Amino acid sequence: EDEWERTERERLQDLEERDAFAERVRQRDKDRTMVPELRKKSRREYLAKREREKLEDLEAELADEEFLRHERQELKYKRRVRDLAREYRAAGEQEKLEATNRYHMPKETRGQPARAVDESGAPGEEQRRWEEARLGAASLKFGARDAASQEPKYQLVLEETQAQQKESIQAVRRSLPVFPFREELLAAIANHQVLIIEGETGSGKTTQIPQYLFEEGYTNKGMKIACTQPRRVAAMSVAARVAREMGVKLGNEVGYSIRFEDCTSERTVLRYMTDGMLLREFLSEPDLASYSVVMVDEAHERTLHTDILFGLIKDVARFRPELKVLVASATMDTARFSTFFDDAPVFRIPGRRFPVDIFYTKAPEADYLEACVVSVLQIHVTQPPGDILVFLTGQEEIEAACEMLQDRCRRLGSKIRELLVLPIYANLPSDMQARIFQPTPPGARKVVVATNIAETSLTIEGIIYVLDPGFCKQKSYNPRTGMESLTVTPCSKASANQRAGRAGRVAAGKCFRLYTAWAYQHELEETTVPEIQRTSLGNVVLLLKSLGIHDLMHFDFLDPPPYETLLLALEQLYALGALNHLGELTTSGRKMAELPVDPMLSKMILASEKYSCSEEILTVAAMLSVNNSIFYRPKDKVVHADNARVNFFLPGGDHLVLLNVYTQWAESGYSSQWCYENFVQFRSMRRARDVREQLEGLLERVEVGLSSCQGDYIRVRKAITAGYFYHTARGYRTVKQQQTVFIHPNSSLFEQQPRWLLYHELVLTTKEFMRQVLEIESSWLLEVAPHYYKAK
Amino acid sequence: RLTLEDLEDSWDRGIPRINTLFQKDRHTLAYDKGWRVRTDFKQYQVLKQNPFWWTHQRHDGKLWNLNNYRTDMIQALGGVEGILEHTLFKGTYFPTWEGLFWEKLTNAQRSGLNQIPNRRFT
């Protein structure tokens, strides 16, 4: 597909030409758009701005110097003068604080009262606060505080290698299992440019292979080596470990670039990024002239963007004579990747493993939540060293497992010691997640019950005994019904193999299978379905069409996506304002594909300036761009969290509720204490703030001004309905697919059933549910998309 | 950390009663202020008179334990067999005493004396 790359390059130069024309239109629109008193005003602004700028920059320079006799004297002088300035501003703040703390008996105010300025340390300090209350109620001491007088106070007589640390660092680096295999690996690198590397984890391949390429001197002319990762946090861990191996700070020759965080200071040799990054410089640069060797992450995730990267890397290997590209792997299923890459060589690396002998239950059962608890207790009565991990497949049963295990553990006192239980979610606040990585107490047999985060993403030390019921949720989408179901399924054999690989990471594993070995050998599948067959592809069909590829149904892949998914994606992009009569991308389609969120969400932006109110639907799209769920619904509490949810409620769906959440989070200091007091996760909505910031930055490229209405929420819902015309259903039934619907209990309109409503998502778990509904009247529904809408 | 064995000895001691530090509902009990005065003015609201007006089992804690009184009273009355010689236990023909266990409409009156438990006591 060399002509595909030529067409892609030509589309990049005409995209640059369209960007230049839009830039010229932007400066055309921009050009079409007392003396001592002025001196004192200019000096006031100049010294105020320069004072706050130098005061901001000085401790940043001291932190940069700390991260990096005369210099020590200058650093001591700078530390003393910044401490002096800090206490000077603290003395001024103290004067204003004692000016605040007076009596000031209240004026009789006509009308409704207004809330004045309020706090303290809210997250987690109420326990020690109430302990202080009990200690104050408990402590009894009489007399005055001055009682040290008349004390004789008799006393007791009693009776009359830093270079070694660096050499230990290279000894640890030479202790890797890839260290005997590095010469044959670089020889196979010099042999073929498409070499596939397999090997079970713990071998340190992804840290040492770009390292051994860096002492191979492949970055010599300035063509930097790139390594991609399936997730950002693992990229941070790998880049931090490589930087601590080198002793070089990040932003330098070991550097990273992920979403909202690009620490690369234009000297980066080892560049660590994600697959969305590599798709983004494919969307900006046609050929990797600035990249010598691209390191590819493992395909056992089977991430959708990594499959797109596999197709583009195969097109590059058709096009370029050499790049020495290389793909990591975990298990032995590299024959498909070898045959995909034109009989690619396969190099295997052994890793450090332990006996992870799989046990058995001689019975088929379909409960796996009482038997797992009994298995945890029976593991707790046998062999004392080890930590226990239990796999599960959802929030609502793992909180019940935590409650059941806590009730069984509290039923025994001095018998059965410790057994602290910690759950893992994705929508868990990060303090409970960071409690896992703390070391266990010496009398404890620490149990970390978990979902598949510990299987795929997180690596936790000390685990020996691992339960596995062999069930995981799948986000399966049916394009024949236009409906997507997240349903619990039995797992795969490779998933159980990587679960056992996660089991005996440090010591000899004791992985307990929770079903029969006959069903494992025969009934259990051996291959996990990838992402492109399970899910809809409406986000990335526009990405493939923006890169000049027209043969979407004949594009190269590891396995082809189903034609019904592509048919519904192309039918939606026909219904959206991006495709021509010939199925070609318009300039509005270039505006669709500029900003990277989903097109069905990106019609908010093209609906903006048609109904104004751009910032409100921008923040609405920011909360609809989140990954983890908003609002905190803990085990117990309930009533306070439900009241905090109801306090944000507005008429007209929960999009206005999310807009109200971002509005009240504004003019509040963006504090974590406000989100803690209102049961909002301060991990997922900071991501919404960053998404809103990135989409605000990407507003000149679409040429949409910062427009707002301040009250016209009918205009906001009209712009949402202009963005959402395909996602409508009414009559306890879909208006198009004729599928019955049920309102979700977590929605703001669970009661007060509406006359006309739209939505955002159609996840089926138990009933066909209703996620992110909104009130409409089906009056402006005919005003937008008239080809799709006819006859009520 | 503070273990179970650190506070197992001092578990039911103290006038604020150390175990009150680890109640289930202590977080919403942290906002309960001025409750002794609520009892001493709840005598003006509730018709029945509270003898335990001066304490609260969630705040102050359980300030007494009378579990030994029942065992010592059973011992001082002559043991279980010496108690059951006075009763109709032998007439019931039960094999042992260890398995023993006890217990929207309109009406003309309901303030009358329930004669059934007095009859079974007699």
Binding site: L156, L158, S414 | E5, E8, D9
Partner: peptide, 28 residues
């Protein structure tokens, strides 16, 4: 709970531990 009881008696009133603490205070 004999081991926890010897732990409590080593964490008891213990003038020997006060001798150890004052000896390390005077020596260092």
């Amino acid at each position: 709970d004999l081991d926890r009881m010897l732990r409590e008696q080593e964490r008891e009133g213990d003038p020997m531990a006060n001798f150890i603490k004052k000896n390390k205070a005077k020596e260092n």
